[PDB]
């Protein structure tokens, strides 16, 4: 991150623009036997399974596109959006970076018990650590 700085940044939000870019749940990846992770997580209290499939270049390692789905709770859409903005245009040493902590205090309220609609980073931690296994790089997995 770097100060450009946009002063109209706050008024808008990247998440809508990111959603707009791909019609519809389409991404970009390279094809070889080492292949992209496929990731989902289900919270029964959220009532939906959030599907975060990374589509990653295999010759630069850079995540070109990672798409999300969300259903049920309307509070988990925002969480999944911010788990695709952050890791796009980043490597897998900057997408193995991401923490659950990011979205684990944004629907706060008191997060005495971790809300289900903050489990949208587990969707992509079942994709990028299911990437490390299928890409043939696990150790950061463990």
């Amino acid at each position: 991150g770097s100060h450009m700085s946009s002063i109209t940044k706050r008024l808008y939000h990247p998440k809508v623009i990111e959603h707009y870019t791909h019609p519809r749940n389409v991404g970009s990846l390279d094809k070889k036997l080492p292949n992209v992770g496929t990731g989902l997580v289900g919270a029964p209290a959220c009532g939906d399974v959030m599907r975060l499939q990374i589509k990653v270049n295999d010759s630069t390692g850079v995540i070109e596109d990672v798409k999300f789905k969300t259903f049920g709770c309307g509070s988990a859409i925002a969480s999944s959006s911010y788990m695709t903005e952050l890791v796009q245009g980043m490597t897998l040493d900057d997408a193995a970076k991401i923490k659950n902590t990011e979205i684990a205090k944004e629907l706060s309220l008191p997060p005495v018990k971790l809300h289900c609609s903050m489990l949208a980073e587990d969707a992509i931690k079942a994709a990028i650590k299911d990437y490390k296994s299928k890409r043939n790089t696990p150790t950061m997995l463990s």
Partner: protein, 121 residues
């Protein structure tokens, strides 16, 4: 970068190839952690108006969700970290970036997202 090259003495043939940010010197990472985190964390009528600067601690200050305070472990090991959202994290570096030792995860540009998700919710 060790090379101390981020060339113009190249036609940028070198640049095309995958190349990842690395912080040198030991003051460089300060302007990559608090460059990104504080960028929308001061004065606007949309939320969040100020950040504090202190001696021996330098973190984001946002009174919207609480904060992370970077601490220091007694002489034997350098840096410590703690959070009431994920316990005593413990801290060092490994790529010249801020690398928490819970799982080797960075937090260089993660907490950036919670400044612009303070508007959203």
């Amino acid at each position: 970068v060790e090379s101390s090259t981020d060339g113009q003495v190249v036609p940028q043939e070198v640049l095309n190839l995958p190349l990842e940010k690395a912080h040198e010197e030991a003051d460089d990472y300060l302007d990559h952690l608090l460059d990104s985190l504080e960028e929308l964390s001061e004065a606007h009528p949309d939320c969040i108006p100020d950040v504090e600067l202190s001696h021996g601690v330098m973190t984001l200050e946002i009174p919207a969700f609480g904060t992370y305070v970077i601490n220091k472990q007694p002489p034997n090991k350098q840096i410590w970290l703690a959070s009431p959202l994920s316990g005593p994290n413990r801290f060092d570096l490994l790529n010249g970036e801020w690398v928490s030792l819970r799982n080797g995860t960075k937090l260089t540009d993660i907490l950036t997202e919670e400044v612009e998700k303070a508007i959203s919710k």
